[PDB]
Structure 1
Amino acid sequence: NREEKILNREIGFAIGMPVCEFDMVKDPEVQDFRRNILNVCKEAVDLRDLNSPHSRAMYVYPPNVESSPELPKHIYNKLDKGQIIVVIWVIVSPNNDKQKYTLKINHDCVPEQVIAEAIRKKTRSMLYQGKYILKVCGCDEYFLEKYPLSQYKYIRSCIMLGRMPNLMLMAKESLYSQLPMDCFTMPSYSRKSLWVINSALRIKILCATYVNVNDKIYVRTGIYHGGEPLCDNVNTQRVPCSNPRWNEWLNYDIYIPDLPRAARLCLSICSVKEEHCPLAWGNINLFDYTDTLVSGKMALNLWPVPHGLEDLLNPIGVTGSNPNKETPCLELEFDWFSSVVKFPDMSVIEEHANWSVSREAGFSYSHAGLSNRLARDNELRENDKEQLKAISTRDPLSEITEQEKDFLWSHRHYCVTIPEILPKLLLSVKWNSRDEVAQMYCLVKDWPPIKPEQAMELLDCNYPDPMVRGFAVRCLEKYLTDDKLSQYLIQLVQVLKYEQYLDNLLVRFLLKKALTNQRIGHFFFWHLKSEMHNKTVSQRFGLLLESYCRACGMYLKHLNRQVEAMEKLINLTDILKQEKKDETQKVQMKFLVEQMRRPDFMDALQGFLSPLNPAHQLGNLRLEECRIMSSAKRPLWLNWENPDIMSELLFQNNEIIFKNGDDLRQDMLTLQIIRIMENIWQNQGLDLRMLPYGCLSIGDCVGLIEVVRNSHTIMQIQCKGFNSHTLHQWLKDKNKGEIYDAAIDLFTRSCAGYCVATFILGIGDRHNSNIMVKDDGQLFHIDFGHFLDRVPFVLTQDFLIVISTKTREFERFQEMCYKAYLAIRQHANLFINLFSMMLGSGMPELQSFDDIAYIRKTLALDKTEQEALEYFMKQMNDA
């Protein structure tokens, strides 16, 4: 039809590849994903159509609210007697006359009550019912839901900053008249034995092709559950490098019914010089998406070895054949039994679990030998009920001894009372024993749900089991707010890389959330799109992007405009660092301006939503305000008009830095973690203001960075006006009089925050042109080069002078750092978990759990709350 050809052209553009390419994919898993996912699409579209046009508006302009209606004591103390001063704006007559109406209302007022008082005031000013809506002046953020006004982020931030909220009164019908009438059309592509095998596992390594030039070679193999070998690893015999034929059977110490559901064969082609080196690697799921055990002849195309890979194998690495068929190819053979072997149904596993529990009960009583894994009922003293609890309080990095595993497993039934112990109990399971796993499955099936920040721990590479992953996703489904999902979205997108298959519970959850909240969908699209260059994820992320773009609605036209802008900016920056590298800034800006006159560029670089914050419209390009930045990778400082009617009340112009060359992933994460640290400190009632400015990776070392207006480096302040006293006097000048005290206070609070944040995270060498200051005293670090490898931010005399060593002001400052450091130590498991979820991401500063172990050192986790306070006190003394 006509509507479907337009859709697939638009979807093709958004993803980067035509939809017809997915149809040419002969693999039932890909075609089943494409068809079976469409129910998540259906459900989301139905929810948007439920209370139309309201429910559709809530999809496009979801409330930007905090997770709790409750405000900290320090925030409520900023409200004059628990009341807020709000300015409500009305656009009057054809002459678009802006008319303000100031209210002093209860902070906990619902938008329909704030609208009511506004109408009351508007009537009085001379001496209407629920047909109106509130909007933030200067951006596309609406107050469409019944939340207390103070819960909306813009408002809470206003109370925080001491700024006055500026809202615009709009008619519901003016907003609904803007939302287009969509239509979700159905695509064209849509329309045995078990545990009865009494045998051990063996895999034949037939031969290798596309392996030749540069002593001897062998194939290394292992059977893995996550990054854990389910048995000892087996090698083929060494062979001459040009002639790679083995035709050897490799025998493993695992019996076929003992294979867990998420069992993988991990393999690599290694060289010998002696000095062993992996040449290529590949991993295969022992069971397909249909639960069918792999049988017969199979060929696998291997992958290039990742930079900084420790062992000869890559178990954490992606499953499946390399799509480039002109790569080292390894031919393998698996045993073929009676028919097609399928992993048992849940009821079959239930019977074996009820059987194993009974034959375990009878087993000993009647054994004769000893066992630390046999669950002894009633025999649980108060001293070992204290041992289990203390075990559950250990961080995810801390080792669980073999004796501790036998202890947790024999106590598997009491553990259900301390539900947060589950990650440790799951690690204690002998995943090579089907008897234990059937019993663990039953325990999980009825386990109490746990806090989302604890459930995310079950979503890294240590937990491959589909039931454990299903449990985690199930906890997220019930307890994860849209605020918290948005906050942890980059880690939840990364962990899709640890998923054995295309179709899973996590992919279904995230997609439903993306197709029912456009703010989640925007970043869900961008985090997936930004990795479409990685051949390891292209198909998975591509297929998920196709199913997203098919059901997102009119936002695909908006995302397509964003994709066109970014593409033209890459084209432009490619030519400036290649063809015109040694040309003058004047000659290069002349090329840009000549290229700007071309109609396809005029359209693409204006009239689109900001990919950093889609609530921001980018109008006309103010070329006179633009520039090629003097940095090596040629960043573009870009300036657009904010076409909002009330642009003046937020920012008249939007300024974004476009950069092609630098990998922005490390910045993206450090900035997120800074935002989480600041949100922790705020919840704990200590206002240590941070600046987690926007930074978004849009592809292969390409991205957008938010410009912070009215900011200058420490160096620049020292320069104009060697010298080490200028800092205080500059701030004294920029904030003269009564205003000064608030600026000194804003400098200290911000400074304490970054001292602790940089120390905990181990941020790269801090200098005069890495740290910045705003006219009001707000201090913030930039350029997050390398993390987790020590005191980087050395508090010089400059910073100390502004604060006030032997003062009431510096004692106040030390107390700010102590309170902040202790607050992050209490939340250490969360940070550990976020960094762990990021091991899938090819970040060279985060390749192994060893890199994450640095936070355990800086947060003194193996010590005590007092021994840690002493550890940080000592580290901060070493200037």
Structure 2
Amino acid sequence: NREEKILNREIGFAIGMPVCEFDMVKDPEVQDFRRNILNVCKEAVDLRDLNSPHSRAMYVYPPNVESSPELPKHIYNKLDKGQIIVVIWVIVDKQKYTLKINHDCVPEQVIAEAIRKKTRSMGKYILKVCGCDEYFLEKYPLSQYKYIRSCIMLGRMPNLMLMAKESLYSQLPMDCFTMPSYSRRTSTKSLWVINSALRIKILCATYVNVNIYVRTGIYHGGEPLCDNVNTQRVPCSNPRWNEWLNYDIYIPDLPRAARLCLSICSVEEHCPLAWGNINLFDYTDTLVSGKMALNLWPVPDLLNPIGVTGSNPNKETPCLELEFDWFSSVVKFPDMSVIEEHANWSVSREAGFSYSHAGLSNRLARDNELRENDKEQLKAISTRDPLSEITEQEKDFLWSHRHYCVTIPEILPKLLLSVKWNSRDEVAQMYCLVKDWPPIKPEQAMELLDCNYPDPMVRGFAVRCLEKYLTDDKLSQYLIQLVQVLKYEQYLDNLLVRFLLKKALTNQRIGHFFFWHLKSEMHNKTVSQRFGLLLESYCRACGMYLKHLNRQVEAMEKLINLTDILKQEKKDETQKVQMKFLVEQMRRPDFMDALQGFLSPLNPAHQLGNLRLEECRIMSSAKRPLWLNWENPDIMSELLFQNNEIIFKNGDDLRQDMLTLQIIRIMENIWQNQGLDLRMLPYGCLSIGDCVGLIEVVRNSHTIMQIQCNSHTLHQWLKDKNKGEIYDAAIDLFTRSCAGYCVATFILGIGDRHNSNIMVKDDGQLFHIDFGHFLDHRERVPFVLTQDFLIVISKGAECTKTREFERFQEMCYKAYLAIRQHANLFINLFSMMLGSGMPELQSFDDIAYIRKTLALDKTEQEALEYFMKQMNDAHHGGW
């Protein structure tokens, strides 16, 4: 209890709300979640204690490693006959030892050769990256570590520090995981034996304050299971309906994930005033019964089935009182034994159907009447993108051939949307198909966790595909989306949240961003309880890292508080006076300690040492962000970077930039693996709160305006920065990077480019900043190549009619079609992000912008001609 109280304060500080507020929640789902989730906490801690010293180090310092050991061919060509030159430092004074060695060498082999060269100068060691807290604790090939592959790709010398194993292990403390205090804690009839249609009683509304009627519907995801039913019209002075609304569904046919969606509307031009959604079955599989009160949400269509389920935690809001049916017994959803037997009964009955019986329905087909054309038709349908319309004929067709669909596993999402979810006979059969369904790729499985797929059997299958096949690399890459799709889950306790929590608690690189993605949305009352309770479970079992997270939370909090004062109190004051106030307030003993000596939330391998106050400044950009500079206190910081530079911005939504930078990284990965070296720059960006976040500074980079402050000025600047033999590499890097950003920005519909949001590095690497908006915010061309860009592309020249420009065009075409081939991934990544509150990504029609820019209905050659035409019209010729 004494140690628990201190831990409760630590967790309360981390999550931004006290633990006691969870204790006072009456809802038994909340209290069951808190108790039952501790299984995952226990399991994770055991894996860390299994092989205790090394396995604890593996948790804290996991290998930053690529998914595949196999190297792309053009990256292998950068090596000297498949060998890499590596520098290994030994602190005795620092002593370097340059080794020329095979790229696929194991760290232990690399350590041995360093000792041999040290012996020429006359398993107890581990390799560390010089300048940051990144270690090579696992037996991978050296080239698979992301630091080395980055070094090979960029043509940089890898600098590693030889360190004693016991020096690392002694730093890692043993955290004893303790279970909390809350650990120690008519008839029943089946759904299918209730011969009755669905009825729901709407009683009355309270807190209906204005200067009406209740619309309702029953939904499986975004799909209606029957017609919407309205109450009779009533004046807002007395909202008391007391009507039994009758729905066209048999109760036995209600799917597991069935939801009552409702709204109070005003009356023609109808308009929603407030909305609310309810699960028709609770977390214990029990059908909702008796009286209930639902506090509604403000409108951001008359109903909102995409919106989150459950009551508004704000109780000073419109509150509809509801009553459900009574059957003199506790109604529960049937077990899988009952479902399997019913499916088996249906399959055998259908297999007995005659020619004429099967002829009654297009959803029924005979077993020995599957021709070669219809098999290839199913294959053709499966290749189509997620936003492509599946007609009712195709749905009937897909379902009738569902047993053949098992042989083409990737078609599952199409088949699932073809199912009649208001028919227990079909759903029961679909459950048995999903149960034994073969594994699909993690990227394909991710689609089945978005808002179109609410069924727990379907989502369980998706989670199992991730458990079996999703690497830690790709989990880290897609964590943003996987956190978002938790919002679509019916219940607090589910297979997805258990999978993500276990990975967060067995991989501290994952756990770090897991914490911050959840923490960043704790202001949002749509997800505050779920994320708060999930964060509690994480903090209770993450070990020593809670204390390091609390350093980061306090550092951010003091930066939030400081920037709030400057944009409220000292709004209209000069830069000199604001800076004097800033430096004085930061130099306060409590502030100064809080704002230095912690890990970067952008990358927890980076230690932020002492602040360089003289290097810090208030920027002239929108919302006046802070430019912050810390010393890197790493002993070999000079070999990576001496100073860590971060932009702290308080005022603007940084989630759009975060998503774009992630997508840019994924686009770059596709191009690099395909074998076209178009270097992008997806710099770090992290939303930490409500319109608050961090941005990674790229060193030695300048905006186009800063270069200029003639058309040849930009090309002349790169000449001066890259004189002699380096010049050709700089122009090449510029052309290749410019080509990637041209293609990326057009596809995504990024905000209009200009001289202040395009940047160029000294070496020639072009990139974009401040994305802000994407998609349909007819298809625009954000990055118009002015003559400045074309002149440098053409090496100073009629820059349109040159071989350098024709080369540049071919890079753009190859890059365009490469992304077209991976269109489903990007559509799915955007679809998983619809639950987020980004205003430009609210519906599937917003995502349909990518369908247009990638020209998916059109052919591959027609897609190039479309892309060429957009570039031609934007630039007024050339393409």
Q: TM-score range by the shorter chain?
A: over 0.9
Contact 1:201 1:254 in 2 (8 A): yes
Moved more, 358-367 or 105-114: 358-367
Q: CA deviation at 1:873?
A: 2.1
Render the CA deviation track for 1:78-137: whole Å, top value 9, x for unaligned: 001111000000111xxxx111000000000000000000000011112xxx10000000
Contact 2:555 2:595 in 1 (8 A): yes
1:197 aligns with 2:194: yes
Contact 1:656 1:707 in 2 (8 A): yes
Q: CA deviation at 1:811?
A: 1.7
Q: Please give the secondary structure, in 1, of the residue aligned with 2:669.
A: helix
Render the CA deviation track for 1:327-346: whole Å, top value 9, x for unaligned: 11100111011310100000
Q: CA deviation at 1:874?
A: 2.1
- CA separation in 2, counterparts of 1:341 and 1:16? 39
Q: Please give the secondary structure, in 1, of the residue aligned with 2:583.
A: helix
Q: CA deviation at 1:797?
A: 1.3
Q: Aligned residues, how many?
A: 862
- CA separation in 1, counterparts of 2:120 and 2:417? 68
- CA separation in 2, counterparts of 1:840 and 1:332? 27
1:386 aligns with 2:376: yes
Render the CA deviation track for 1:228-249: whole Å, top value 9, x for unaligned: 1110001001101111000001
Q: Please give the secondary structure, in 1, of the residue aligned with 2:210.
A: coil
Cα distance change of structure 1 residues 762 and 137 upon mapping to structure 2, 3 Å threshold: same
Partner of 2:848: 853
Contact 1:665 1:843 in 2 (8 A): yes
Q: CA deviation at 1:163?
A: 0.5
Render the CA deviation track for 1:350-385: whole Å, top value 9, x for unaligned: 111111112323454573961101132010111111
Render the CA deviation track for 1:527-569: whole Å, top value 9, x for unaligned: 0000000000000000000000000000000100000011100
Contact 2:14 2:550 in 1 (8 A): yes
Q: Please give the secondary structure, in 1, of the residue aligned with 2:773.
A: coil
Q: CA deviation at 1:813?
A: 1.0
Contact 1:375 1:409 in 2 (8 A): no
Contact 2:355 2:366 in 1 (8 A): no
Q: CA deviation at 1:654?
A: 0.4
Q: Please give the secondary structure, in 2, of the residue aligned with 1:41.
A: helix
Render the CA deviation track for 1:431-468: whole Å, top value 9, x for unaligned: 00000000000010111010001001111100000000
- CA separation in 2, counterparts of 1:583 and 1:793? 36
- CA separation in 2, counterparts of 1:375 and 1:290? 37
- CA separation in 2, counterparts of 1:599 and 1:356? 74
Unpaired runs of at least 5, structure 2: 795-799, 875-879
- CA separation in 2, counterparts of 1:369 and 1:598? 83
- CA separation in 1, counterparts of 2:440 and 2:525? 35
Q: CA deviation at 1:212?
A: 3.3
Of the three residues 744, 750, 767, the one matched with 1:757 is 744
- CA separation in 2, counterparts of 1:552 and 1:236? 50
- CA separation in 1, counterparts of 2:78 and 2:360? 66
Contact 1:656 1:705 in 2 (8 A): yes
- CA separation in 1, counterparts of 2:366 and 2:417? 20
Q: CA deviation at 1:800?
A: 1.1
- CA separation in 2, counterparts of 1:877 and 1:78? 36
Partner of 2:533: 543
Q: Please give the secondary structure, in 2, of the residue aligned with 1:877.
A: helix
Partner of 1:132: 125
Render the CA deviation track for 1:405-440: whole Å, top value 9, x for unaligned: 000000011010000000000000000000000000
Q: CA deviation at 1:703?
A: 0.4
Render the CA deviation track for 1:696-737: whole Å, top value 9, x for unaligned: 001100000111111111111122xxx211011100000000
1:114 aligns with 2:114: no
State the identity as a percent: 100
- CA separation in 1, counterparts of 2:644 and 2:60? 22
Q: CA deviation at 1:190?
A: 1.1
- CA separation in 1, counterparts of 2:419 and 2:253? 13
Render the CA deviation track for 1:144-196: whole Å, top value 9, x for unaligned: 00000000000000000100000000000000010001100011001193310
Contact 2:191 2:251 in 1 (8 A): no
- CA separation in 2, counterparts of 1:605 and 1:74? 44
Unpaired runs of at least 5, structure 1: none
Q: CA deviation at 1:806?
A: 2.0
Contact 1:770 1:781 in 2 (8 A): yes
- CA separation in 1, counterparts of 2:696 and 2:236? 52
Q: Please give the secondary structure, in 2, of the residue aligned with 1:876.
A: helix
Q: Please give the secondary structure, in 2, of the residue aligned with 1:724.
A: coil
- CA separation in 1, counterparts of 2:621 and 2:764? 26
Contact 1:752 1:813 in 2 (8 A): yes
Moved more, 795-804 or 734-743: 795-804
Contact 2:196 2:251 in 1 (8 A): yes
Q: State the Cα RMSD in Å.
A: 1.3
Contact 1:218 1:270 in 2 (8 A): yes
Moved more, 67-76 or 799-808: 799-808
Contact 1:133 1:142 in 2 (8 A): yes
Contact 1:135 1:142 in 2 (8 A): yes
Q: CA deviation at 1:867?
A: 1.4
Partner of 2:294: 300
Q: Please give the secondary structure, in 2, of the residue aligned with 1:293.
A: coil
Contact 1:59 1:518 in 2 (8 A): yes
- CA separation in 2, counterparts of 1:50 and 1:349? 39
Q: CA deviation at 1:603?
A: 1.3
Q: CA deviation at 1:573?
A: 0.2
- CA separation in 1, counterparts of 2:388 and 2:562? 49
Q: Please give the secondary structure, in 1, of the residue aligned with 2:357.
A: coil
Of the three residues 229, 234, 241, the one matched with 1:234 is 229
User: TM-score by structure 2 length?
Assistant: 0.97
Contact 2:358 2:365 in 1 (8 A): no
User: TM-score by structure 1 length?
Assistant: 0.97
Q: Please give the secondary structure, in 1, of the residue aligned with 2:448.
A: helix
- CA separation in 2, counterparts of 1:145 and 1:365? 62
Q: CA deviation at 1:210?
A: 0.5
Q: CA deviation at 1:279?
A: 0.9
Q: CA deviation at 1:325?
A: 1.4
Partner of 2:797: none
Q: CA deviation at 1:631?
A: 2.2
- CA separation in 1, counterparts of 2:409 and 2:265? 43
Contact 1:213 1:242 in 2 (8 A): no
- CA separation in 1, counterparts of 2:722 and 2:130? 27
Q: Please give the secondary structure, in 2, of the residue aligned with 1:341.
A: strand
